[PDB]
Amino acid sequence: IFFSRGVILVEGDAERFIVPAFAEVLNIPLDMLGITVCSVGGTNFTPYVKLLGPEGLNIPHVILTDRDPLVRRRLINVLDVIEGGVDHEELDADEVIKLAEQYGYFVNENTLEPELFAGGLAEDMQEVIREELPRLRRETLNALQQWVDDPAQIDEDLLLRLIERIGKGRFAQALAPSVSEDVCPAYIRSALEHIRDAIALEHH
Ligand SMILES: [Hg+2]
Ligand SMILES: [Hg+2]
Ligand SMILES: [Hg+2]
């Protein structure tokens, strides 16, 4: 918001509710620290970096975004703000990505819900889907049971289709009680630790 000590910038509603849930099980207390999670409702982070950057309010902030590329241009647009005057057109995607981590901007190589399904939350996500979609046809229920039994053969199209039908935010809120420290995606842990460190250092 505007009375925050820090901001975690996020693409949509799923991260808006999953990120605080992972913060709690990492013992990083976002509310007590005065850190708010803000959805930019898409992939354009530039207005928010302008608001929170050195020429705006100068508020510690981090970014969580998906590789998809077109992430190179997306990050060049925020690097032009937070590292102004410097040219970045010469850099390739990987150099832009590793430069961006210095400013707390982190890229995920695998979209959030499929990563969680594969990365240890398969049976919890199946339980939410069937609570929220209680009249799934038999073929879809069998496909979903097949992804649980073998989380490397997920039909990603159908999984995301089911989650979007439930509502990405509603799904994330229903899943949030199930997350644990050991299934936290690396890019979320990196961003949470980065903003925590920045706020704690100001106390130091
Ligand atoms: Hg905000
Ligand atoms: Hg904001
Ligand atoms: Hg917000």
Task: Please give the method by which this entry was determined.
Answer: X-ray
Measure the CA–CA gap between 191 and 38, rounded to whole angstroms: 13
Q: Is 66 annotated as a binding residue?
A: yes
| Tokens (6 digits) for 20 | 């605080």
Specify whether the CB–CB gap between 180 and 188 falls below 8 A.
no
Measure the CA–CA gap between 4 and 157, rounded to whole angstroms: 37
Find the farthest-apart pair of alpha carbons in the chain and give their distance in angstroms, rounded. Answer: 58
For residue 56, how far is its CA from the centre of ligand 3 (angstroms)? 17
For residue 198, how far is its CA from the centre of ligand 1 (angstroms)? 17
Q: Is 68 annotated as a binding residue?
A: yes
Specify whether the CB–CB gap between 111 and 117 falls below 8 A.
no
Q: Specify the residue for token string 């981090």.
A: 62
- Residue 55 to residues 43, 45, 83, Cα–Cα distance (Å): 21, 16, 11
Ligand closest to 57 (CA) is 2
Torsion of CA 76, 82, 85, 90, to 10 degrees: -20
Residues forming beta bridges with residue 67, ordered by sequence position: none
Torsion of CA 44, 164, 115, 75, to 10 degrees: -10
**H helical segments located in the chain:** 13-25, 30-33, 46-52, 71-82, 93-101, 112-116, 122-132, 138-149, 156-166, 168-175, 186-203
SS3 (DSSP) at 11:
coil
| DSSP secondary structure string for all residues of 89-141 | TT--HHHHHHHHHTTTEEEESS-HHHHHIIIIIHHHHHHHHHHHSTT--HHHH
